[PDB]
Amino acid sequence: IVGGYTCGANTVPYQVSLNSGYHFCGGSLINSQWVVSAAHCYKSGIQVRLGEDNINVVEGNEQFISASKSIVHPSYNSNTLNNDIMLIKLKSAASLNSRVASISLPTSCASAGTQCLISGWGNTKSSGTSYPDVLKCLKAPILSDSSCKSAYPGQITSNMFCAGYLEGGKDSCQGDSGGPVVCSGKLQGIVSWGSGCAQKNKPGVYTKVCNYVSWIKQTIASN
Ligand SMILES: NCCc1c[nH]c2ccc(O)cc12
Numbered sequence: 001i002v003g004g005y006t007c008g009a010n011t012v013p014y015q016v017s018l019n020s021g022y023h024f025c026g027g028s029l030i031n032s033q034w035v036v037s038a039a040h041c042y043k044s045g046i047q048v049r050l051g052e053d054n055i056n057v058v059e060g061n062e063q064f065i066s067a068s069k070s071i072v073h074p075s076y077n078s079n080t081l082n083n084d085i086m087l088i089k090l091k092s093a094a095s096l097n098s099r100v101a102s103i104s105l106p107t108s109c110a111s112a113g114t115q116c117l118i119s120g121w122g123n124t125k126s127s128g129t130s131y132p133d134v135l136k137c138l139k140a141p142i143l144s145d146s147s148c149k150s151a152y153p154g155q156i157t158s159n160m161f162c163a164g165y166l167e168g169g170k171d172s173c174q175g176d177s178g179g180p181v182v183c184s185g186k187l188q189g190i191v192s193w194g195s196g197c198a199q200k201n202k203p204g205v206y207t208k209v210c211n212y213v214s215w216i217k218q219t220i221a222s223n
């Protein structure tokens, strides 16, 4: 997260770190046994780390649970990033509490102008690299689809939205991939892609979660 702030330990209780020897992506806990992330975060050997603040220090609220199954969206295209969503099932149910809690799926899509919270352990620099240990947060509005399409000609599908600041300086970044965009207590977006981070006229692009709720629910119901 570039241009954000330190969230505060366990203040984003649905935020997970996906770990394969090291943090490599975010995700969102959506029930005791399932995480939603980006398809571009797919790999084998995932351990889901819940209850994290400092990802390099055991602070006492963590739950580490291996993935038993990953399901990349059937229509994910890794070249265009269309349908950039994946589900991860945990080998055992997480113990839900104030610091490890699921985030509600949307029943309605969100509109341009809605304020959201974006979070992760990604790079905090727009030029250069610095990776934080503690979770970072950014409040950002959803941008109009027309401004999103104008910012990224030929690239924005109906499964994507932009959020952030056209003036630059505030954005998600590398390592925030797969993490949440939460608006009014609902998971509306997943950190997906962009042209660099926090660049003028190049806001972050996010998977439009509301389009996937039916797929998520039916997938959970049979897996
Ligand atoms: N807005 C963050 C988009 C994003 C996701 N993964 C990334 C990796 C590198 C980068 O410059 C940007 C990204």
Ligand SMILES: [Ca+2]
Binding pocket: 052, 053, 054, 055, 056, 057, 058, 059, 062
């Ligand atoms: Ca920790």
